[PDB]
Amino acid sequence: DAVFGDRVRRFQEFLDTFTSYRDSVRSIQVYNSNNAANYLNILPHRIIISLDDLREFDRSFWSGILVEPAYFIPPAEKALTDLADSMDDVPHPNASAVSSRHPWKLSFKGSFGAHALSPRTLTAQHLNKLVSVEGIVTKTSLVRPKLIRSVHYAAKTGRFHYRDYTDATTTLTTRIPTPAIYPTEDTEGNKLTTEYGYSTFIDHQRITVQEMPEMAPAGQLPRSIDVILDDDLVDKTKPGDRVNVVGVFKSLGAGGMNQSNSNTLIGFKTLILGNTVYPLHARQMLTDFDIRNINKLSKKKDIFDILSQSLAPSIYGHDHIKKAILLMLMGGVEKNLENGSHLRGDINILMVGDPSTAKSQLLRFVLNTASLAIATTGRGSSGVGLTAAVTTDRETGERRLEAGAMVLADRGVVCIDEFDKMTDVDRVAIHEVMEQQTVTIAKAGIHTTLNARCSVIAAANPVFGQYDVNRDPHQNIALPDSLLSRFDLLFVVTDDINEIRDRSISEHVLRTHRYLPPGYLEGEPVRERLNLSLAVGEQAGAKLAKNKGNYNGTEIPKLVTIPFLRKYVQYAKERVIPQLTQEAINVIVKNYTDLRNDDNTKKSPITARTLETLIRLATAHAKVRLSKTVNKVDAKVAANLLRFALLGE
Amino acid sequence: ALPSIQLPVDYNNLFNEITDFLVTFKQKGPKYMAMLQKVANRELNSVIIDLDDILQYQNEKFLQGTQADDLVSAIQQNANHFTELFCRAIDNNMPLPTKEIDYKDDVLDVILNQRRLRNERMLTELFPPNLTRRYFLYFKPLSQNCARRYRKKAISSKPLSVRQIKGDFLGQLITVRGIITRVSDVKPAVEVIAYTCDQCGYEVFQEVNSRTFTPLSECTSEECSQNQTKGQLFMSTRASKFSAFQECKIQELSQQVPVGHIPRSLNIHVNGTLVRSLSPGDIVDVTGIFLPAPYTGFKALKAGLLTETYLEAQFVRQHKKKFASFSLTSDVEERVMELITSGDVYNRLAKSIAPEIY
DNA sequence: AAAAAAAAA
């Protein structure tokens, strides 16, 4: 009755108290006006409020929102729409577009306290309450528009009529249902023609979010919940993404309380009307002094060795492997030609060795430190299901392709373990990807080519239990040469027994195990921790807090932390695209001619494709030092690394 | 019942301006009378409307302070309504045939003449105009240079991707781009359905624009309207009016797909003389009307507000390339003369296939 | 449509 007006005026008072939101709204308005008629982006009518200030202003309204949003959000939205209408000033508007009536829906950020849950923790007593849930995106539905309000016209009357339709998921408050019956006749029988272009249609999509399997009870499968979101943010993110979704958790449907029930045990349906979505990413933007520090480090002489040594400090030796991983994470550029079609741009690395030489651990480290990566096991995968699958959507009743493991890793890196133990059939499915970086699906009436430009890193064991240095390299490796020729670098590792190395590695490994997490005692095991205190988060250059990287002093050479290295990778993969020059060309051609005509035994045969590997390695090294041109030093280091990987020191 | 709202659009002035444009337009005299004259002589089978002509006519008549509004904006905002406005304007201003007609072949007109000589002799039914209509109406999207000619942002075109089409583009005229994959066959579609009345006066007609259809049971014939039944009404195949119907779907190009996604599709309906103007496996620039389609055909009683959508074709630019089956032309004749002058050819042809391979 | 167990080649 009047409580709606009371809440509306209180929210108007609160909006008038804080002057940031008004500035944002008028900025949106002026940008929208400038987009209209000046020689393709438009800002949506959505604003995000920080409920910390609301709590500091009025505790009653804050509690009402966080406990029963159904009776508090609509008044706030009405007040915001009224403010926007009052402040707006358009003297000559349009006809069809003026009847949009966007209500300026809201988004929230700030501390939630006990209302930040996980998909398993959602229970009965959290219904009808605003919540924020973390999780992983499992699968999505198709974007389908839905009607809101229809526009009708009658020729005889000349008066435009309108009828409004709402559903259970359309509004927070339950109202009397309305069918989709089109009004075609007037009260006096005049004919009504539906007017497209004046009616209102809003986009609709359903997604399902799953709890992270890492934080799960022992011996329990992960559980998932479904989220409905509409209008804006309709097609953000994708399956295989870590998200934080804030919205209202409410039930819907009769659920058998009508006469349709067949058995006693009938349960209701629960669903979340998502209000906002944030990318978790376990942040992604560089600051000014960050760029200053990156430039200062890149102008140093020996940045590349420092960066290589910084990777996985708990692994002894394998320095060239670390350098190869560093060059692979930020490989060369892709080439396209009007007549030359397409040229591959990145690097793939394969390692083979006898057991217990720290390959899987390095693979896990590469998974953890990469921008985007997917873990795959040879035995626990099927090639047909690795690329694409056919699934029938429950809503639309049609069958649509579901993205496979490798497609999700587009512009990423894929790590495969037990590669030599992986079925031969599915191997061809890999080779196709290694051929043109594109998978073709022609099955059940769907003919589509899907882009997959990822890099693949794998580690495999030799045919015997241990490597035989006296045998043919082809004899020791079970994989056929057809796919082995694709990999740019092949590495063979062996645990040669030497008492000096044995003592050094023993001391190192014992040093690692004598570690204690900061601020926690040694008498009790590790305990799980809660989420961050802030549900949604966000003097320069004189501190160098984490810029220098050296957390602990152990050697004269420097070190850098993981976040700074990742920021360096993000900057390098975007801001620099080097161009090769003839000075490095001479060195590359000379060393290729020399290596080809050395005429001695070697691990693998060499052919014309190795020069492409040299070119992209030089490009990657030019990217490492952040230069737009390729110097002969990059050619020299690439040749040295190749000689090490193929001859051995 | 239904609340009423006020809109700045009124169709009276729009129709008057449409008629004035159709009559007075100078590009042979007026062009839009030449097309109507060819249609009257049963020569032209479809009518194409250029929005650039309307825009430039309005712009050049704006120099005199008589014009008050613009039409192309309302065309872009809504399209289906202007189709029936245009067909009514054409039907009102159809000139007489200046050429002879082989009148015996038009069996529809012969049957209608027989019905008229039956009914009007007694001293008759006013048949719907679309049954009498023989032509098809098509629109053509404007060109960007014409928009550049003036200050206004009358742009349209802009061949959006399949996934770039949102729920706010329903009812507008939009242009899409993509590869055609599936093309169905050609099948007739009903426009006006006629029933015979078993020799009981006039034969009842009906027109259904929906995708479903229901038949009649009783008829308005006077002796049939008499208190006892006189003959069961039966559908007549000859008297009805049909139209060619075809459907196809288009897929997004691989260049426009965002990373880590699966391309989407779009359904296209096509009717009239434009049928069979496209083949599977080509890049096209299709312009049409983006219309909603009811879900009730599936008959699931779900998705109370969710609906399916489709595009109705209006103009197709086939684009891509043409094989032409080496059809002889003058230019290629001078080309082969140049080849004759070139001397020995096959060595250069071998050198010129794949220079990238050494 | 796609994964998993069984007997015969």
Ligand SMILES: Nc1ncnc2c1ncn2[C@@H]1O[C@H](COP(=O)(O)OP(=O)(O)OP(=O)(O)O)[C@@H](O)[C@H]1O
């Ligand atoms: N250089 C090293 N530094 C630290 N730990 C090492 C090193 N070499 C081996 N290890 C240890 O050896 C153990 C074996 O690990 P892991 O199984 O990942 O190795 P691997 O060589 O990939 O073996 P596999 O062929 O069985 O997969 C690990 O606990 C790892 O810490």
Ligand SMILES: [Mg+2]
């Ligand atoms: Mg291992």
Ligand SMILES: [Zn+2]
């Ligand atoms: Zn009868």
